[PDB]
Amino acid sequence: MNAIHIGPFSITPAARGLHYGGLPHHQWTLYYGPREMAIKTLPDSYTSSEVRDEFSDIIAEFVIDARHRYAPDVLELVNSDGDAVLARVAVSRLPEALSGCIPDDRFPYWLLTASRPRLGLPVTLNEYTALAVELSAPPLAWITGLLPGEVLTHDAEEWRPPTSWELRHVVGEGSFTGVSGAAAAALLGMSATNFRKYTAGDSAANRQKISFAAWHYLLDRLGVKRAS
Amino acid sequence: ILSTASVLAFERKLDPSDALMSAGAWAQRDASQEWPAVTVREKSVRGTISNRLKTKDRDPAKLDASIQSPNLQTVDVANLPSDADTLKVRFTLRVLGGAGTPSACNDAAYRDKLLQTVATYVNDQGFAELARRYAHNLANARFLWRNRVGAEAVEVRINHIRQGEVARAWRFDALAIGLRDFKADAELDALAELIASGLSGSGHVLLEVVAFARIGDGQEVFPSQELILDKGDKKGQKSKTLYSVRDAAAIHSQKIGNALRTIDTWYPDEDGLGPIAVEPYGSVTSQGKAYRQPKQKLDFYTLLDNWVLRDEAPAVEQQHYVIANLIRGGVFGEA
């Protein structure tokens, strides 16, 4: 019938039509970006909702995969022996001082990495709080795996504005963050229509690009990047 | 801040070759170049039921039905030829050096501190006591494990190869050099100085060690036993196979290495039993009991961490043990 925009996914049916059995059908294809995903022939009688829920399985699968693909690292605060884990913190970016390390009886507290090659640092509790404050991962940080490095840099010269697809990951509809367009507009402090010029693409009319500060504050409010 | 590295992989020093076994007669050892190799052969065994029963197999009729069906196996045995009372065993040992340098490491600061600790140890007391003890373990045929136990006479020749030719030959008598006493001998001091030069990186040391043991004519020799997947029948169950390379029975190289590592006389329990192998937590598999328990803080890991991080240098015999553990290599670090 036409493509259904759910999250960054587009359920695009084929223009040609067939009649499997005695019923009409259509080749519906799930696109994540310019890449197709799972494709299933849906009978013409199927409702748009049916189409969406039908592909919902693939949709959910992708979301789960992405979350796992970009799950943030986790540092463990352990005791002097190192076997018992007193605390676990999901880090955004590993500290810049840890090295091949194993807890020593000398120090009461040690920070280590979740992986086998345990690289870490012996820190006290206040330094542990300082490190957890400056390097914590926001709850939806895995979406930063799906975004390129140019749209996530804090340097404006290396910063590239997000496209319609990259913005359309996390603004409205069944997004990965789950928020709506009006909610994302109210987070950025402006009305719904001015954010609707940001969301809608196609021609250059009503295609103002979001600024660097607004994009990073929106990422802060959605808990995707810089939200410690 | 000097934490222990998460990986501290160490390449083993004293790398042994696989010890080939041949057979011949005594006093023909000087012409033992073309001796026929010991060949692993098959022999069939049937056996009575002889393990301890669990108080329900102790019924008379059921045990009678048990003995009426003896169990059948085909065991691989290694026997001398009947015109041969002497077993010859040949291997080569490579002494590398650089014992304190890990092959893989994570923390470069910990690696540099461990390198400085090992270099400090070499500076006051170089590789002399450990090399003398390794020379003693070469001198007695401890690599003939059950294989010099009932031997009338054991002899060991250790040759030094330089450019494909022999440099220094060390003919010994393994009956005199005991398996418990680490005494001093001039030829043993010369072999200790050669292993000292190998372990300190002064030169390359490759030693060809040949042991002749007088067991008996056509008697049983004891090579390394392999692993059986048990994919056959029950009559020819193949319950025991012995290791060989090319139609020639042999001993595993790691068994020879564990024989040379039996120098550890500094475990906190009583040393009247004798030396045990160089290993973390002093674990001999025959006794099933670990000397150098981590409760007593005399194992390798606690002593190494106290030596490197806290700079608590242990007793001199214990740092000998720690550096011998570094010589034997390992996957020290987090596991």
Added chain:
Amino acid sequence: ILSTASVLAFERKLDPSDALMSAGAWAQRDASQEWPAVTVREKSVRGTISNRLKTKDRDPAKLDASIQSPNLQTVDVANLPSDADTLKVRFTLRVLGGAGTPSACNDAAYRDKLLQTVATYVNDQGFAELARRYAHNLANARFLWRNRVGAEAVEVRINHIRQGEVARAWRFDALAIGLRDFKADAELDALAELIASGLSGSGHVLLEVVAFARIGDGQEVFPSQELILDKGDKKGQKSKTLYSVRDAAAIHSQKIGNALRTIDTWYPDEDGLGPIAVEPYGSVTSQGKAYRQPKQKLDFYTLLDNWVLRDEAPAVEQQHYVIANLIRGGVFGEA
């Protein structure tokens, strides 16, 4: 604005073949064309506890129970025969050229700018320092990774196979030409101009490289190690699997290529280690750390982006590092 291309895949120059291992004797290396190959055999290993215990296995009873259940494994092992001390390694290296041209480039203008940057590099200094350092890594047997740490004498013969025949022969000493110093030698310079003509595009270069190492009679040689699927029983675990091509032990081609790549001495850390492999962000697997961090602004990507986009040409050592990464090749650019 001349941004970087999103797709910047590069083909590798200096393609090495798989390095076949054979076994033989010293001074027979002039006729080593019939030598029997090193066969990946199997041997059984029995082990006790030798890893760090996580404070709950440190109880005496639990440790002794772990000792009484040893971990039996079967390991793939590569050993020379008892009459063979020399390990021969043969591989062919094909020098292609056209290292400036990417295999894939989204941006034409970026492709023209990168080609002009490589052209102005070659007009400034040709493929001469990089080819000299690659020829040094050819001359020393750095491709013999663990078959050189205890080798008594190593020798490398490199032949220029033009029309299926030797156009020029070179013989070297891999121990005299160390793994630390990039000195000057006449035969090394001639091999450097041959690799220079290969890398520029002047001619086709194929080199047959043969290596001989004095390890020892029956000693363990170390091929590249494969990856274990871990599906079978814990008794026959197969913890270690070595690499063979046709009943014949071998080293992986990318391991040989990484060892030839080990020419990067211009990383901002000190010269205590020596040359490392030319990787983006200068990674070393054994040290577990990255020389040339992006934070210290000496990684390949920052240097290339300064050299190409904004014409900030770095020092000639960093230019050599960038062109050596282009010779190495990779999937550069944003995915």
Added chain:
Amino acid sequence: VTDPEALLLLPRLSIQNANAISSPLTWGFPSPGAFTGFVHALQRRVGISLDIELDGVGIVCHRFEAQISQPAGKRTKVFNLTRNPLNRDGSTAAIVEEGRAHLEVSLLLGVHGDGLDDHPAQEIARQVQEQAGAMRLAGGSILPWCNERFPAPNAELLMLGGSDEQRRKNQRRLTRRLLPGFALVSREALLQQHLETLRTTLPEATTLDALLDLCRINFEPPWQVRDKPGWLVPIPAGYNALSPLYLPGEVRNARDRETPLRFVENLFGLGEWLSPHRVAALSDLLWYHHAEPDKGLYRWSTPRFV
């Protein structure tokens, strides 16, 4: 209601088109009431002439195949149908959706009576087998095993064992005979205690909801599955009274005018399929009638199970 003096093993019986709709709420394996009624019909037809009684049936169900299909786009299933003959005007008649199933079951029959002392065991076993080979078990014809390799006679085993070990060996051999199947037993105690567990979890919960919870796969959030003790099928557990017991001639169009008729409603209980080696004796698997006709409650169960 009584301990059987002997157990007769009717072998692998291939029932062709059995009633797959066991109950108004359940489908699949047929009702145990069909099996108990078949054994009572066997006692009615050939049991009296052999001077024996046939009460109690243990079902093993060596094979089940359902004449069903899964339509595309649905996770449920539909029943394959039979083309009924046309009406007298040549039109297609109204379709009643009736499902069919190919079964292969073996039956343990409880035999008690003096005729066990009057005939050989194989004689009465062969007589009840050749009587059962021309009957029906759940609405399907019984395939009497013609021209295959090796036919299976019965094995009537006397439950009055001379010794406990000989009785144990006989029961284990009889269990080894009926090996590729599952004994279907009644679980009134398990369903009642699960009802009490749900009533402690949430009050005013009926036995229907406890029966439903013991059949659906419950997904619990941290996403694991709430386990079950056994297979825990919903079975028809009998018939409850829906009307007073009318006179034999009172009910119009009854099956016979000599048997009293009472309108009933289906009773639903919890059954369990177990491997038959998990029972103390094979007489525990016998399905017995239990009428209690003053209060309705025309049930079939497995008494003396645990």
Added chain:
Amino acid sequence: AQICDEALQYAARLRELEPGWSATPGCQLHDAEQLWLDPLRAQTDETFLQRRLRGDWPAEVGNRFANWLNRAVSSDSQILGSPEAAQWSQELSKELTMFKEILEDERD
């Protein structure tokens, strides 16, 4: 108990196979379990393998299955330190005792 039940059930459908599949040629076909895998080969061979299952009385095969059941346990040192491994070994020994007793009287 359910798992060893299924093992018997597996052997049960191994009664539905060919009488002599265990006598086919092969380099590796699990001949230690083949005395219980094919009970009907005693009809195929009069004295080559019919007396072997009677004299041997193969009940150790479940111990091999117990080894496979030892791959069904978690690799946790907390269970081995506590008596949870003791209770696991006790119920394992009881259920494979029942399994071995079931496999013992297969000749009747």
